[PDB]
Amino acid sequence: TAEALELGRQQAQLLRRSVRRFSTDPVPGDLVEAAVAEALTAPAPHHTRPTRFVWLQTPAIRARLLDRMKDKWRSDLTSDGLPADAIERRVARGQILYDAPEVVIPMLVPDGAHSYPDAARTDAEHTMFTVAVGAAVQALLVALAVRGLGSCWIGSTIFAADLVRDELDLPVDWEPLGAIAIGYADEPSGLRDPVPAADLLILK
């Protein structure tokens, strides 16, 4: 029992997978709320609240936002001189945001930011706030897993920040930091068994 509970603690993050395919089972709303409450236990700089989670419950609003992001995405890749074949293969990786039972957009906001007159420290503060939001993202993906819910974070909305703010009527200083698809995994997976860090850990 003691061994099992310690094991469980060391399985929590290993339950976390970047799930591509979801079942059509509905997701109980209270699990998302409770998961988000747990995500916001991630650390943040003193007296700041860098993270906001924006839950796209209205299906028509999600679809309109994604459709516009898709149009930007095709037009960008079309400027790059990509052939139409390779464009649909690229944009089709975003279909998961259309199909997921629920989508949540993590956002940065400057709540508690210091005001510096110089660009260097202004940028540094912004980067610090961004790291904090990413922490909250992992905490969400884990808090969902631990409630049996699959999820996938994708950069997505970072490349369409204006579209996101416009479509959601959000102020200029809310910065989207991707999109989190949520649902019951269509096909369950076994746990992660992490490999050693090897060259990803540098000793000085």
Ligand X SMILES: C[C@H](OP(=O)(O)OC[C@@H](O)[C@@H](O)[C@@H](O)Cn1c2nc(=O)[nH]c(=O)c-2cc2ccc(O)cc21)C(=O)N[C@@H](CCC(=O)N[C@@H](CCC(=O)O)C(=O)O)C(=O)O
Restricted to residues 77-106, the positions that interact with ligand X (CB under 6 A) are 90, 93-94, 97
Q: At residue 150, what are phi and psi to the nearest 5 degrees?
A: -80, 160
Q: d(Cα 8, Cα 2) in Å, to the nearest integer?
A: 10
Per CB under 8 A, 91 contacts a copy of itself: no
Q: How many residues make contact with ligand X (CB under 6 A)?
A: 20
Residue 87, binding choice from ligand X, a copy of itself, none, Cβ under 5 to 8 Å by partner class: none
- For residue 197, give the 3-state DSSP assignment: coil
Residue 19, annotated as binding a ligand: yes
**Eight-state DSSP code of residue 189:** -
Q: Is position 77 an interface residue for a copy of itself (rule: CB under 8 A)?
A: no
Alpha helices (H) along 80-118: 84-91, 95-99
When the beta carbons of 83 and 135 are compared against a copy of itself, the nearer one is 135
Rounded CA-CA distance 99/183 in Å is 10
Residue 18 labelled as part of a binding site = yes
Stretch of 2-10, 94-102, 182-190 lying at the interface with a copy of itself (CB under 8 A): 2-10
Torsion angle (degrees, nearest 10) of CA 130, 70, 172, 42: -30
Handedness of CA 116, 121, 126, 132 (dihedral sign): negative
We find the least distance from the C-beta atom of residue 112 to ligand X, in angstroms, to be 9
If the CB atoms of residues 69 and 185 are measured against ligand X, the closer one turns out to be 69
Q: How far apart are the C-alpha atoms of 57 and 165, rounded to whole Å? A: 16
Rule CB under 6 A: say whether 155 interacts with ligand X: yes
Binding partner of residue 133 among ligand X, a copy of itself, none, CB cut-off 5 to 8 Å per kind:
a copy of itself
**Token output for 165:** 């703010």
Q: What is the 3-state secondary structure (H, E, C) of 105-146?
A: EEEECCCCCCCCCCHHHHHHHHHHHHHHHHHHHHHHHHHHHC
CA 189 and chain centroid, separation: 20
CB of residue 149 vs ligand X: minimum separation in angstroms? 20
Span 100-119, contacts to a copy of itself by CB under 8 A:
106
38 binds, among a copy of itself, ligand X, none (CB under 5 to 8 A by kind): a copy of itself
Annotated binding site for coenzyme F420-(gamma-Glu)n: 76
For ligand X, the binding residues (CB under 6 A) are 45-47, 66, 69-70, 72-73, 76, 90, 93-94, 97, 114, 121, 154-156, 159-160
